[PDB]
Design a protein around this motif. Structure first.
Motif, PDB file in Angstrom:
ATOM      1  N   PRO A   1       0.831  -1.205   0.000  1.00 10.78           N
ATOM      2  CA  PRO A   1       0.000   0.000   0.000  1.00 10.78           C
ATOM      3  C   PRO A   1       0.865   1.253   0.000  1.00 10.78           C
ATOM      4  CG  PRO A   1       0.230  -0.803   2.225  1.00 10.78           C
ATOM      5  CD  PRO A   1       0.982  -1.774   1.352  1.00 10.78           C
ATOM      6  N   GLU A   2       0.421   2.304  -0.682  1.00  7.92           N
ATOM      7  CA  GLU A   2       1.107   3.587  -0.612  1.00  7.92           C
ATOM      8  C   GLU A   2       0.782   4.234   0.733  1.00  7.92           C
ATOM      9  OE1 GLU A   2      -0.365   6.975  -2.717  1.00  7.92           O
ATOM     10  OE2 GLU A   2       1.575   7.424  -3.643  1.00  7.92           O
ATOM     11  N   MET A   3       1.435   5.349   1.046  1.00 12.40           N
ATOM     12  CA  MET A   3       1.100   6.084   2.260  1.00 12.40           C
ATOM     13  C   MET A   3      -0.298   6.664   2.149  1.00 12.40           C
ATOM     14  SD  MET A   3       2.853   9.488   3.921  1.00 12.40           S
ATOM     15  CE  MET A   3       2.280  10.146   5.484  1.00 12.40           C
ATOM     16  N   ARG A   4      -1.197   6.197   3.009  1.00 15.60           N
ATOM     17  CA  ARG A   4      -2.546   6.742   3.070  1.00 15.60           C
ATOM     18  C   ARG A   4      -2.520   8.208   3.489  1.00 15.60           C
ATOM     19  NH1 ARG A   4      -5.042   1.092   4.157  1.00 15.60           N
ATOM     20  NH2 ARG A   4      -2.940   0.727   4.996  1.00 15.60           N
TER      21      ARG A   4
ATOM     22  N   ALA B   1      -1.756   6.092  12.182  1.00 17.56           N
ATOM     23  CA  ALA B   1      -2.119   4.763  12.654  1.00 17.56           C
ATOM     24  C   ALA B   1      -3.074   4.840  13.840  1.00 17.56           C
ATOM     25  CB  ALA B   1      -0.872   3.974  13.020  1.00 17.56           C
TER      26      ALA B   1
ATOM     27  N   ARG C   1      13.138   1.618  -0.473  1.00 20.42           N
ATOM     28  CA  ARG C   1      13.162   1.764   0.981  1.00 20.42           C
ATOM     29  C   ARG C   1      13.781   0.555   1.677  1.00 20.42           C
ATOM     30  NH1 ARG C   1       9.344   5.229   4.834  1.00 20.42           N
ATOM     31  NH2 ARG C   1       7.531   3.847   4.589  1.00 20.42           N
TER      32      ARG C   1
ATOM     33  N   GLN D   1      11.441  -1.885   7.341  1.00 17.77           N
ATOM     34  CA  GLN D   1      11.115  -1.021   8.473  1.00 17.77           C
ATOM     35  C   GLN D   1      12.062  -1.220   9.655  1.00 17.77           C
ATOM     36  OE1 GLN D   1       7.614  -1.606  11.084  1.00 17.77           O
ATOM     37  NE2 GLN D   1       6.816   0.318  10.249  1.00 17.77           N
TER      38      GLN D   1
ATOM     39  N   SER E   1      10.227  11.348   5.509  1.00 26.84           N
ATOM     40  CA  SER E   1       8.851  11.037   5.870  1.00 26.84           C
ATOM     41  C   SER E   1       8.659  11.169   7.377  1.00 26.84           C
ATOM     42  CB  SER E   1       8.472   9.629   5.405  1.00 26.84           C
ATOM     43  OG  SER E   1       7.116   9.347   5.692  1.00 26.84           O
ATOM     44  N   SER E   2       7.885  10.258   7.955  1.00 26.16           N
ATOM     45  CA  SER E   2       7.656  10.259   9.391  1.00 26.16           C
ATOM     46  C   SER E   2       7.848   8.862   9.954  1.00 26.16           C
ATOM     47  CB  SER E   2       6.243  10.739   9.709  1.00 26.16           C
ATOM     48  OG  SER E   2       5.294   9.745   9.357  1.00 26.16           O
TER      49      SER E   2
ATOM     50  N   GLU F   1       6.477   6.450  13.515  1.00 23.48           N
ATOM     51  CA  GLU F   1       5.555   6.399  14.644  1.00 23.48           C
ATOM     52  C   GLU F   1       6.239   6.042  15.961  1.00 23.48           C
ATOM     53  OE1 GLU F   1       2.555   3.414  14.331  1.00 23.48           O
ATOM     54  OE2 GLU F   1       1.136   4.473  15.627  1.00 23.48           O
TER      55      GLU F   1
ATOM     56  N   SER G   1      -2.939  -9.789   2.413  1.00 24.18           N
ATOM     57  CA  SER G   1      -2.740  -8.351   2.346  1.00 24.18           C
ATOM     58  C   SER G   1      -1.825  -7.798   3.437  1.00 24.18           C
ATOM     59  CB  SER G   1      -4.088  -7.626   2.371  1.00 24.18           C
ATOM     60  OG  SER G   1      -4.900  -8.011   1.277  1.00 24.18           O
ATOM     61  N   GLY G   2      -0.742  -7.153   3.011  1.00 21.97           N
ATOM     62  CA  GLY G   2       0.009  -6.272   3.883  1.00 21.97           C
ATOM     63  C   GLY G   2      -0.575  -4.885   3.678  1.00 21.97           C
ATOM     64  N   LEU G   3      -1.666  -4.837   2.916  1.00 21.96           N
ATOM     65  CA  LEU G   3      -2.351  -3.592   2.577  1.00 21.96           C
ATOM     66  C   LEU G   3      -3.235  -3.118   3.721  1.00 21.96           C
ATOM     67  CD1 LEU G   3      -3.547  -4.938  -0.883  1.00 21.96           C
ATOM     68  CD2 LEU G   3      -1.660  -3.303  -0.615  1.00 21.96           C
ATOM     69  N   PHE G   4      -3.016  -3.683   4.904  1.00 23.58           N
ATOM     70  CA  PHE G   4      -3.837  -3.366   6.067  1.00 23.58           C
ATOM     71  C   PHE G   4      -3.132  -2.421   7.037  1.00 23.58           C
ATOM     72  CE2 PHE G   4      -6.791  -7.334   6.021  1.00 23.58           C
ATOM     73  CZ  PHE G   4      -7.236  -6.952   4.770  1.00 23.58           C
ATOM     74  N   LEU G   5      -1.823  -2.270   6.876  1.00 24.43           N
ATOM     75  CA  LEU G   5      -1.047  -1.360   7.712  1.00 24.43           C
ATOM     76  C   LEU G   5      -0.414  -0.292   6.829  1.00 24.43           C
ATOM     77  CD1 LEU G   5      -0.388  -4.538   8.001  1.00 24.43           C
ATOM     78  CD2 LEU G   5       0.620  -3.873  10.179  1.00 24.43           C
ATOM     79  N   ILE G   6      -0.738   0.975   7.084  1.00 26.29           N
ATOM     80  CA  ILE G   6      -0.262   2.060   6.227  1.00 26.29           C
ATOM     81  C   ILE G   6       1.260   2.031   6.048  1.00 26.29           C
ATOM     82  CG2 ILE G   6      -0.052   3.826   8.034  1.00 26.29           C
ATOM     83  CD1 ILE G   6      -0.419   5.929   6.163  1.00 26.29           C
ATOM     84  N   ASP G   7       1.688   2.066   4.793  1.00 26.82           N
ATOM     85  CA  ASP G   7       3.097   1.929   4.454  1.00 26.82           C
ATOM     86  C   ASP G   7       3.998   2.920   5.179  1.00 26.82           C
ATOM     87  OD1 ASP G   7       5.516   1.304   3.243  1.00 26.82           O
ATOM     88  OD2 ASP G   7       5.084   2.562   1.494  1.00 26.82           O
ATOM     89  N   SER G   8       3.664   4.195   5.044  1.00 34.11           N
ATOM     90  CA  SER G   8       4.522   5.219   5.577  1.00 34.11           C
ATOM     91  C   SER G   8       4.286   5.207   7.069  1.00 34.11           C
ATOM     92  CB  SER G   8       4.170   6.585   4.991  1.00 34.11           C
ATOM     93  OG  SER G   8       5.276   7.468   5.058  1.00 34.11           O
ATOM     94  N   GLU G   9       4.750   4.101   7.637  1.00 39.29           N
ATOM     95  CA  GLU G   9       5.086   3.975   9.042  1.00 39.29           C
ATOM     96  C   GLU G   9       4.142   3.450  10.120  1.00 39.29           C
ATOM     97  OE1 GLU G   9       7.377   3.426   8.549  1.00 39.29           O
ATOM     98  OE2 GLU G   9       8.939   3.745  10.058  1.00 39.29           O
ATOM     99  N   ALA G  10       2.963   2.946   9.790  1.00 32.36           N
ATOM    100  CA  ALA G  10       2.245   2.288  10.860  1.00 32.36           C
ATOM    101  C   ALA G  10       3.255   1.312  11.440  1.00 32.36           C
ATOM    102  CB  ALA G  10       1.040   1.551  10.323  1.00 32.36           C
ATOM    103  N   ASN G  11       3.659   1.533  12.684  1.00 30.30           N
ATOM    104  CA  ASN G  11       4.626   0.647  13.321  1.00 30.30           C
ATOM    105  C   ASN G  11       4.131  -0.794  13.315  1.00 30.30           C
ATOM    106  OD1 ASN G  11       7.231   0.808  15.248  1.00 30.30           O
ATOM    107  ND2 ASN G  11       5.796  -0.729  16.033  1.00 30.30           N
ATOM    108  N   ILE G  12       4.610  -1.573  12.347  1.00 29.59           N
ATOM    109  CA  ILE G  12       4.077  -2.910  12.068  1.00 29.59           C
ATOM    110  C   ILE G  12       3.801  -3.754  13.312  1.00 29.59           C
ATOM    111  CG2 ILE G  12       4.364  -5.047  10.778  1.00 29.59           C
ATOM    112  CD1 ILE G  12       6.013  -3.672   8.777  1.00 29.59           C
TER     113      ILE G  12
END
Lengths: 40, 151, 150, 401, 26, 201, 38, 26, 51
Positions: free
Chosen positions: B25-28, D37, D225, D228, F126-127, F129, G18-29
């Motif tokens: 997914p891209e950044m929401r 989040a 990237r 994480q 970016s950011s 968490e 789906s890994g499409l459930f956690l926002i890419d730009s940083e939802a701390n997995i």
């Protein structure tokens, strides 16, 4: 995932790990944070 | 198979050798939630400032029927906001009130004018006074709304 | 009457967006013929400028006016960035809003966002008096090349 | 005339009557630094509570913005579109104000200021004054630190006021930063320019887009990237692996210091002056009384700083504009009514008798407003101007006989 | 002072794309 | 471009603009046709000079005062189309290269230019968490000190001994090329400002 | 397009694709998965 | 009184989790 | 010609709202006159020292 503190707490003490943001916000608004600082 | 490097040998080093290529997914930038039981993808129709909402919404609701056939199996469009519903209620409300007043005035201008032809005079003063206003608004550009009808 | 000016300045901090994009943009839009007030939003890599015009201003005059001013300011902006003109509508223009859901599971958030972005958006925008069909929520499929540093 | 002096000093004042739309929007404010989040979780939790009320049929929560310039909402801000059931389905004594009450009483989380408004109403208010709430206070200046200090005081006095339900001022520098303070001298040692080091911030750590796939009409983002794991935290950033141009294996800390800091979250400007808006939510009282009380509390218990200015925007700003136009409007209507009597009967003494018959029709309306339990507003105001021409119409058909 | 409780944990009832673990060859 | 009598001023503008669009491509790569202010030479309404008799401030300081304070305090005035700076000195970071040091250090003029071009920008990571909060990763990199210029890396041995811009150049603060000069009462050069009114106001 | 597992799941278990459930730009997995249980 | 009180229904709806401080090697 | 002799701008410093020009140039001595230009030092790509 874990962080070590050099000081500030005591083994046994409970600390919030989920829902921290909103709670700290409330503690921020209610003046608690400022009260915490004025005590030391 | 994006080439990164190649020996004289002809043995190349591919992107796959230093990276994993996955579909993610891209950044929401925005999140939508429905009824508190799931994240969803939504769409919002935006009207050109100064144009007719009611007029547009119908065209939208109809085009969506044309597409119910073209839509993937199992896909459902649940509407979350419809300004058309308020409009109908608002215009039916002012219409109703316009009818009640007319009749309540007639009945009253008919109990002080004890002749029927006398009452039917002050009465035919409205359906005519109406037309002139509506005819005027069309030369003005004033559509019907609780405020234009309220007057 | 409101004309929006959205500028993207990727990766740049709020304070930098303000100093190099937003501020220089609002100060020139303030001295625009018919401008009543101008609201600026400097975000992380985004610059929203809202130009409010005085009462009884021809909406399309206001636009054609902002455009010419944008031209004589495009150079006063950072190399990469370009000042984009907003849609012909406002927040009030939000007329009909819907959610896309597949209860069977056959389709997911990404599939639906694509359905929206590349089918619905174009089936609807061809409707008269409709200025914009915006996608809200959902997931944008991204080809993620994740590099192993080692 | 002296009897109208009582209902007068008993009624409230709004800009317009609260028009009830079939549904309404939940906007809840919060402190600057929330994460997408968490904010998104905050959304679903909030929706589940909204939907728990019998009167609501659908809930469409929305954090962040939709793909359109008509939406500059942060992922920290929440707009949910609540759809209320048909009015012929509300519980017994249920009313709009009563529904909102169970909503603002049921749906609530710590550090989250509730705000409930009808869609169209809100969308217009923001386009006019910018404020999403009915009552708004604008703190302005050129020192974010100062204006933030001001908005904070004004914030807490606002909640001491009788009829206020929630008051939150958006902070101008509650943003959180992780700074990569690159060291030219250190980096130079490895033959790296500032730009060289930065590529690891934009692509390695951040996920900057690098290109797009072309798939028919559509396009999709491509990006580079690290996993994480390597960018989990500050310490992680300090050990971020870097393969230098000269094939040296170093860490990000070898060429940069990484410091956590606090600064601007989002710079809000109005006519090029920075500003913070304090969103106040009062719905039990009438508006004008609340603001008039806020103006007192604020005046006495908050000492303005030099560059700082405080103002009351929102609907109240629209009200004050209308009142200055109305008080300058009465003479107009009183000299025009004066001359159409001066013309019909021609008598100077006579006409002053008829036009002086309307201060009797004013007392009539005011008493009805009070009994009907209404508030003074541009709505009622219009009624009295129209009513005047009728007490002056009558005024003539009594002098005719 | 509503004691009305909600399930804090996340929710996804509007459909989920699923696949079952198969024993097979690469 | 002079328009005939009785031409709507804003029509004329909106007209030139569309023509500029269909000509932008007929121009050399780098160049872009800019649209002028909404005024003319006649619009020159109020003109002033900036002078510090004590000496505390100089031509450069005053030009900056004008360019970055006065210009913005005035342009926010209705009916004012432009507040132009006249005269004064524009502070310039002058990297003066010693041609001989270039040879002595084996560094070409081109290499210097490229190095400079990579030592003056910020970047976002970016950011990330932390504690349910959003942490914006911001990377410094702007030139802001003379020392920063001096430490623009040009070359580095396997040893780790680098060659800096300071090794082939002197980085001084000088005046830019004056495009206009302003003199007051025949006893000094000064920095001035002129208020320009929107034609027809 | 299909990964083989050495251990962790049992044959037949259901799994969301789906890994499409956690926002890419940083939802701390780690913390983003935590939110899905309790 | 240092600290802040919060309605246990809100915190429960928020889904507040907690962790106990211990001592040992990182 | 553009940078050694002339003082062509190469970039700009970003200082808050403001910007200031940055430029490369030989000392005026090497570009004083025509004859000076004829002896303008050039370090070629192949590290040759010419004029």
């Amino acid at each position: 995932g874990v962080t070590a503190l050099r000081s500030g707490l005591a083994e046994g003490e409970k600390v919030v790990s989920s829902g921290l943001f909103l709670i700290d916000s409330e503690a921020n608004i209610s003046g608690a944070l400022e009260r915490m600082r004025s005590e030391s | 198979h994006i080439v990164l490097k190649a020996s004289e040998n002809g043995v190349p080093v591919y992107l796959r050798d230093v990276a994993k290529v996955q579909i993610g997914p891209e950044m929401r930038r925005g999140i939508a939630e429905l009824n508190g039981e799931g994240e969803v993808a939504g769409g919002v129709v935006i009207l050109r400032s100064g144009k007719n909402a009611r007029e547009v919404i119908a065209a939208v609701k109809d085009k969506l029927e044309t597409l119910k056939s073209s839509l993937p199996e199992g896909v459902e469009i649940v509407t979350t906001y419809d300004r058309s519903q308020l409009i109908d209620r608002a215009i039916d409300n002012l219409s109703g009130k316009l009818l009640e007043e007319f009749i309540v005035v007639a009945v009253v201008c008919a109990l002080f004018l004890w002749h029927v032809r006398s009452a039917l005079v002050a009465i035919i003063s409205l359906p005519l006074g109406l037309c002139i206003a509506f005819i005027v608004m069309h030369f003005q550009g004033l559509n019907a709304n609780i405020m234009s009808l309220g007057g | 009457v409101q004309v929006i000016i959205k500028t993207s300045y990727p990766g740049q901090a709020p304070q930098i967006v303000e100093n190099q994009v937003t501020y220089p943009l609002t100060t020139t839009m303030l001295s625009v013929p018919g401008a009543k007030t101008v609201r600026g939003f400097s975000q992380f890599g985004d610059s929203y400028v809202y130009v409010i015009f005085e009462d009884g201003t021809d909406p399309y005059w206001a636009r054609s006016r902002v455009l010419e001013y944008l031209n004589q300011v495009q150079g006063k902006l950072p190399a990469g960035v370009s000042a984009e003109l907003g849609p012909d509508a406002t927040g009030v223009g939000w007329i009909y809003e819907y959610a896309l859901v597949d209860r069977s599971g056959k389709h997911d958030l990404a599939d639906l966002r694509s359905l929206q972005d590349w089918f619905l958006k174009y089936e609807l925008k061809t409707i008269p008096d409709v200025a914009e069909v915006a996608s809200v929520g959902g997931v944008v499929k991204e080809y993620q090349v994740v590099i192993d540093p080692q | 005339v002296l009897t109208v002096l009582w209902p007068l000093n008993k009624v409230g004042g709004e800009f317009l009557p609260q028009i009830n739309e079939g549904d309404l929007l939940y906007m809840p404010s919060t402190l600057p630094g929330i994460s997408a989040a968490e904010a998104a979780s905050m959304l679903q939790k909030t929706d589940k509570l909204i939907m728990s009320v019998p009167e609501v049929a659908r809930v469409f929560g929305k954090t962040g913005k939709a793909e359109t310039a008509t939406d500059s909402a942060p992922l920290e801000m929440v707009e949910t579109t609540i759809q209320l059931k048909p009015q012929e389905q509300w519980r017994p004594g249920m009313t709009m104000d009563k529904i909102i009450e169970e909503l603002d009483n049921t749906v609530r989380l710590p550090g989250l200021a509730n705000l409930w408004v009808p869609p169209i109403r809100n969308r217009i208010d923001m386009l006019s004054t910018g404020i999403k709430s009915p009552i708004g206070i604008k703190v302005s200046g050129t020192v974010l630190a100062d204006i933030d200090a001001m908005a904070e005081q004004i914030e807490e006095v606002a909640r001491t006021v009788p009829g206020v339900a929630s008051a939150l001022a958006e902070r101008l520098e509650g943003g959180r930063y992780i700074n990569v303070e690159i060291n030219r001298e250190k980096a130079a040692r490895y033959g790296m320019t500032v730009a060289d080091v930065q590529l690891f911030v934009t692509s390695a750590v951040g996920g900057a887009m690098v290109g797009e796939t072309v798939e028919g009409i559509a396009r999709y983002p491509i990006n580079l990237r690290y996993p994480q794991s390597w960018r989990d935290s500050p310490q992680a950033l300090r050990q971020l692996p870097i393969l230098t141009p000269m094939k040296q294996q170093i860490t990000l800390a070898d060429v940069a210091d990484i410091k956590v800091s606090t600064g601007p979250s989002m710079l809000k400007t109005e006519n090029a002056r920075p500003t913070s808006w304090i969103y106040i939510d009062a719905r039990d009282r009438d508006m004008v009384s609340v603001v008039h009380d806020l103006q007192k509390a604020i005046a006495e218990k908050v000492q303005l700083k030099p560059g700082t200015s405080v103002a009351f925007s929102g609907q109240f700003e629209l009200l004050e504009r209308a009142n200055h136009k109305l008080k300058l409007m009465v003479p107009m209507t009183l000299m025009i009514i004066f001359v159409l009597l001066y013309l019909a009967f021609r008598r100077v003494g006579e006409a002053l008798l008829i036009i002086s018959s309307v201060p009797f029709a004013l007392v009539g309306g005011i008493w009805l407003l009070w009994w009907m339990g209404f508030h003074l507003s541009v709505a009622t105001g219009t009624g009295f101007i129209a009513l005047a021409g009728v007490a002056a119409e009558f005024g003539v058909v009594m002098l005719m006989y | 002072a509503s004691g009305v409780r909600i399930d804090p944990t996340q929710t996804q009832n509007l459909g989920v794309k699923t696949a079952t673990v198969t024993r097979g060859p690469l | 471009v002079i328009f005939e009598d009785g031409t709507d001023p804003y029509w004329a503008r909106s007209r030139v603009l569309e023509y500029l669009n269909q000509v932008q491509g007929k121009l050399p790569a780098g160049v872009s046709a800019e649209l002028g202010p909404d005024a003319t030479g006649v619009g020159w309404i109020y003109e002033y000079a900036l002078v510090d008799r004590s000496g505390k401030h100089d031509l450069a300081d005053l030009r900056s005062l004008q360019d970055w304070f006065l210009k913005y305090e005035l342009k926010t005035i209705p009916d004012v189309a432009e507040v132009a700076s006249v005269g004064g000195v524009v502070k310039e970071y002058q990297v003066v290269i010693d041609p001989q040091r270039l040879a002595q250090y084996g560094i070409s003029l081109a290499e210097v230019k490229s190095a400079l071009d990579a030592s003056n920008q910020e970047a976002g990571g970016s950011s990330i968490e932390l504690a349910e909060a959003e942490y914006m990763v911001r990377a410094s990199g702007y030139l802001q000190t003379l020392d920063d210029f001096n430490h623009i890396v040009l070359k580095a041995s396997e040893n780790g001994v680098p060659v800096y811009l300071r090794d082939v150049a002197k980085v001084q603060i000088g005046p830019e090329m004056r495009r206009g000069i302003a003199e007051l009462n025949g006893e000094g050069e000064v920095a001035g400002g002129v208020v320009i009114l929107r034609s027809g106001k």
